[PDB]
Amino acid sequence: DDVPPRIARAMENEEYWDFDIFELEAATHNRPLIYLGLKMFARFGICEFLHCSESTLRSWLQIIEANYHSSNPYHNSTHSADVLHATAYFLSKERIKETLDPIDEVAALIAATIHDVDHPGRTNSFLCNAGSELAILYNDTAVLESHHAALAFQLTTGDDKCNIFKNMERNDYRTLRQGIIDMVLATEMTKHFEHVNKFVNSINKPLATLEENGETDKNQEVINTMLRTPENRTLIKRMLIKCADVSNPCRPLQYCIEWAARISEEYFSQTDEEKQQGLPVVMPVFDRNTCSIPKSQISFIDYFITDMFDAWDAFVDLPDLMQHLDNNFKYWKGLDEM
Numbered sequence: 001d002d003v004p005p006r007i008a009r010a011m012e013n014e015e016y017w018d019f020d021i022f023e024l025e026a027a028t029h030n031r032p033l034i035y036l037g038l039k040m041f042a043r044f045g046i047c048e049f050l051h052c053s054e055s056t057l058r059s060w061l062q063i064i065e066a067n068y069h070s071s072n073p074y075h076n077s078t079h080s081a082d083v084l085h086a087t088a089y090f091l092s093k094e095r096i097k098e099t100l101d102p103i104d105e106v107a108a109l110i111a112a113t114i115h116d117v118d119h120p121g122r123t124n125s126f127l128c129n130a131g132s133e134l135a136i137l138y139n140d141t142a143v144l145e146s147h148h149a150a151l152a153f154q155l156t157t158g159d160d161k162c163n164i165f166k167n168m169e170r171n172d173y174r175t176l177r178q179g180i181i182d183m184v185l186a187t188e189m190t191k192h193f194e195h196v197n198k199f200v201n202s203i204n205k206p207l208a209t210l211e212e213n214g215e216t217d218k219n220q221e222v223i224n225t226m227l228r229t230p231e232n233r234t235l236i237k238r239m240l241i242k243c244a245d246v247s248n249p250c251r252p253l254q255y256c257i258e259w260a261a262r263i264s265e266e267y268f269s270q271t272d273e274e275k276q277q278g279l280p281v282v283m284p285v286f287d288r289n290t291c292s293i294p295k296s297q298i299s300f301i302d303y304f305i306t307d308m309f310d311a312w313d314a315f316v317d318l319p320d321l322m323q324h325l326d327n328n329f330k331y332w333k334g335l336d337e338m
């Protein structure tokens with residue numbers, strides 16, 4: 001409640017898409033997740049659903065945020081706060097509000113908080129090739145993604161004061177647990193095109209077919225009944241977490257460039273380490289001495305972003321995001337100047 005002025009001013013227009021997440025980072029002193037978490041969890045009314053106190057949530061938001069590495073350029077508490085902000089925005093839209101249930105809204109916002117917890121600034125491929133402690137632990141299969149979720153529940157349940165899932169029912173926790181685990185694991189990029197195709201075939205194409213009839217009262221109930229099933233809700237949740245995770249190209253141009261520079265720096269550190277240690281170079285194009293950042297961002301957007309957000313926009317209707325995507329894409333094209 002009693003938040004100091006600079007941090008309180010940074011979180012004024014937090015419902016809006018245009019949000020100064022880096023002012024919050026500077027204001028909070030690399031602690032943006034706890035302050036943004038407090039307001040976001042309260043606004044939805046998550047501790048009323050979970051039956052937790054304010055002090056239980058503060059201890060929970062603290063211990064996860066401590067395990068986020070400040071040394072990492074991109075994968076830190078500020079990134080998870082940006083994803084949490086993106087998550088809440090998509091949940092607040094009319095398509096997602098009317099489709100999803102309150103249990104799903106809680107699972108999404110919790111998942112966004114923990115999805116990259118204890119990131120080593122490195123990819124899965126690096127850890128498998130290096131023979132890391134977690135690579136051997138998870139058998140070179142969803143190494144980081146399983147570690148993020150597994151460690152998050154170890155921190156939450158393992159300590160009594162940190163446990164936000166203390167007063168819940170037996171059935172309510174397991175459905176919530178299965179929901180959070182699935183959304184965190186869905187962020188793995190090897191299954192990127194799998195999660196995009198399953199979204200288009202099961203949601204968008206049926207919804208496109210049903211919309212041919214019109215806006216009749218009986219037909220809207222069929223659109224409701226079809227989307228609101230457990231299978232399709234999960235596919236919407238898998239798509240929502242994926243989009244919010246890589247929503248930085250759809251931000252305002254200042255933030256887009258900042259997110260681009262940070263993730264690029266995190267690769268150059270990895271590429272320098274792989275050369276010195278004598279590991280196989282899994283990311284050859286992302287080297288500080290040869291990489292074009294503008295040209296790299298164009299390749300990333302064309303491969304991952306453009307087709308995914310096309311599907312997500314067609315479903316949810318996101319005119320601000322797709323307009324920013326067009327403005328940022330053309331800016332990266334303009335920086336060649338040769």
Ligand SMILES: Nc1nc(Cl)nc2c1ncn2[C@@H]1O[C@H](CO)[C@@H](O)[C@@H]1F
Nearest residue numbers: 187189245246248259260263296300
């Ligand atoms: N803007 C981005 N550019 C590039 Cl090359 N990779 C990015 C960008 N934003 C996110 N990523 C990557 O996407 C993955 C998370 O979905 C991570 O491996 C890494 F963060």
Ligand SMILES: [Mg+2]
Nearest residue numbers: 116145187188
């Ligand atoms: Mg990930």
Ligand SMILES: [Zn+2]
Nearest residue numbers: 115116187245
């Ligand atoms: Zn992520």
